[PDB]
Design a protein around this ligand. Sequence first.
Ligand SMILES: [Fe+3]
Ligand SMILES: [Fe+3]
Ligand SMILES: [Fe+3]
Ligand SMILES: [Fe+3]
Lengths: 223, 221
Amino acid sequence: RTEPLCGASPLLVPGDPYSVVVLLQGYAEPEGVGDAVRADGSVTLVLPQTGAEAALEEAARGPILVDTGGPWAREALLGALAGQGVAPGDVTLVVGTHGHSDHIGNLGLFPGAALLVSHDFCLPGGRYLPHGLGEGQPLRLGPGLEVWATPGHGGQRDVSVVVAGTALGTVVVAGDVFERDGDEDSWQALSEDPAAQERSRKRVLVVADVVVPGHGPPFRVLR
Amino acid sequence: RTEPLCGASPLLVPGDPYSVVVLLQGYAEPEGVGDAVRADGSVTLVLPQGAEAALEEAARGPILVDTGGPWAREALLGALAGQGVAPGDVTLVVGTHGHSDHIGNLGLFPGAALLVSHDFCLPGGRYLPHGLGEGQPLRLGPGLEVWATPGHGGQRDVSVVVAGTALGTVVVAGDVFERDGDEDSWQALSEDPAAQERSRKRVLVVADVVVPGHGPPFRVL
Ligand SMILES: [Fe+3]
Ligand SMILES: [Fe+3]
Ligand SMILES: [Fe+3]
Ligand SMILES: [Fe+3]
């Protein structure tokens, strides 16, 4: 069973060593007539408490942003960050779950951050460092903090961020692996590779107590 | 065969009704030791002299094809200004695929329509559906088309084809071509080598000039 996670906005999930704050909740709204959709992706902040393998671990010692929204969301992102006491210049790592325009629209706000966009990792300045991310080999960012390969939606190189040890248990920031709570009958049409995405969805639901989907509010996973 | 395209920088290909200017030439440089690579994507400006209608309207002003990584912001702004273009003047941004060194500065152009891979949205994030496919290009204008060129980034990569320039047909190919002479290097970087080879052949049939993702433009002879 799953229930949308209600509570004070922005949704803050305290934890140790990492807290998670959903800065902007995603949406995807159809229109009264025609087939257009107004949408934007969720943006999540992972906050540490108060070759490529080592660089990732170092870049994760500061604020980590998971997705950035579309370009139109720039002022709202800046405001949300400020609300958490974080200047754009303070962000040390940006993770882009996949390369769609409503998820990676504001990378340029963070020229001082390391960037992990899908499976490509670079230091600030565009020095790309190879690594071995795969479905059987997650990337360790820190204690109880990992990047998973969760292919399917955007293609074979989508990633998710898994945050263990919060007050609500394990939070998975899943990109569009999940569209929203109750997307059981809608996600397949949006998917590049439904078979892969199904494997990824099942994998996430084994570990997650909370899922932050790409286009809706976070939800709890019950057992 | 192919040959590097020589001339004055920035590389300007005049034409009618569209001119093409390579604002920033991409590169991907290995290091003296270890396996790291410093890279950035080519950025091209196409200048005029439901979704189908929106696309034609958005292509009536300056069109940017890719944007470079986030570290390239000031260089991109400078190059645009050198062409008399303010960022606010750009009416359409085309992202060939979603890698960080191609779509790193989308946020500079909030007033532009965006076509990143197969997703088209008006400014503000209103996404409009369309029928782009390998057998169904999107028409932007006279002799200006977006092609579906899958392979490198995945199944939804796109390329911009500009007919009628002084040098003939210019294809802005994203990473469909890494660089002139990439014959034995592109495969390792490809998410679907079968699709990418299909796309490379398609492009080479029509192109007189290719702007690849990580090198200078080259002529096709
Ligand atoms: Fe999305
Ligand atoms: Fe998506
Ligand atoms: Fe590239
Ligand atoms: Fe690429």
